[PDB]
């Protein structure tokens, strides 16, 4: 809660999104392990893209945030929404068993 | 009227009488046979502690973080329902 | 199970007594020699509530009577009115 310190979180994520979205698309690595492959004038080394994938996993994981929030809501509001049929130490207490037993009472037939 | 408050006071006082009588009867039944009431205490206090500690992982900032889903196979309670909940179409 | 905003949460936002009591009771349920040392020690405490309970009961026997008195003073009204 406390939407004073909720905006101060949601203004640091826009920082990171508008800092990652100003990187050049022609970004590439040069590791110290391409010397063992003997790359010619035109040979297409196989470790050129170990930073541009990492600079898109962050940029697309920081846009799929309010999708995993909506999946976590559907998870928690269907695991905690039962809470008395799966957890063993709650469906064995006196009061929970008495309440579940007492909701199932069929109404009395007059005559 | 004053009669309502007077009857309310008599009701409150009878409830205090019930409280004192139950606190008597506990120590009397512990005085007669103490073994199978101390075993009852050690069982039921543990069970009620587990019942009160059945709700601590459903807070605001305990669910917005990641220390429920990842690495909590020690807990095992949720993230094991996902084989069931997808098969029911809820998602 | 992806920590996506966990780092920003850690940026912006940076008992024993009853367990010892339970160990004491688990030691009391081993040797018989303490059980009588419990029992009479409990048996006086029950008496401590009996001296409680009558001090409640002798209050109700007070607090009923005025209400009963509040029903005599109305009924002696009718001792006139019906005879009227």
């Amino acid at each position: 809660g406390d939407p004073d310190t909720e905006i101060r979180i949601s203004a640091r994520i826009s920082n990171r999104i508008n800092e990652l979205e100003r990187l050049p698309a022609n970004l590439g690595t040069y590791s110290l392990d391409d010397c063992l492959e003997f790359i010619t004038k035109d040979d297409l080394s196989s470790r050129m893209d170990t930073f541009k994938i990492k600079a898109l996993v962050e940029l697309k994981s920081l846009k799929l945030l309010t999708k995993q929030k909506s999946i976590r809501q559907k998870l928690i509001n269907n695991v905690a929404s039962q809470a008395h049929h799966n957890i063993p130490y709650l469906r064995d207490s006196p009061f929970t068993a008495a309440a579940q037993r007492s909701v199932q009472i069929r109404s009395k037939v007059i005559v | 009227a004053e009669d309502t408050a007077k009857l309310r006071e008599i009701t409150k006082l009878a409830l205090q009488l019930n409280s004192s009588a139950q606190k008597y009867q506990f120590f009397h039944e512990l005085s007669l046979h103490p073994r199978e009431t101390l075993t009852h205490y050690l069982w039921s206090s543990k069970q009620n502690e587990l019942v009160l500690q059945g709700d601590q992982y459903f807070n605001e900032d305990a669910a917005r973080t990641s220390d429920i889903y990842s690495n909590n196979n020690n807990d095992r309670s949720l993230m094991g329902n996902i084989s069931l909940l997808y098969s029911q179409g809820r998602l | 199970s992806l920590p996506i905003e966990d780092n920003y949460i850690r940026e912006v936002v940076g008992s024993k007594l009853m367990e010892c009591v339970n160990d004491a009771v688990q030691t009391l349920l081993q040797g018989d020699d303490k059980l009588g040392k419990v029992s009479d020690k409990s048996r006086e405490i029950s008496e401590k509530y009996i001296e409680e309970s009558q001090a409640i009961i002798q209050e109700l026997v007070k607090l009923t009577m005025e209400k009963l008195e509040s029903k005599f003073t109305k009924l002696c009204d009718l001792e006139t009115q019906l005879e009227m």
Partner: peptide, 26 residues
């Protein structure tokens, strides 16, 4: 323990902004 990786090599410097790599500089 699982942690989101602190990708420092992508991160542009804040205080100086003249000691970055030449690709992250404009």
């Amino acid at each position: 323990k699982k942690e989101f990786p602190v990708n420092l090599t992508i991160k542009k410097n804040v205080y100086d902004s003249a000691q970055d790599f030449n690709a992250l500089q404009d």
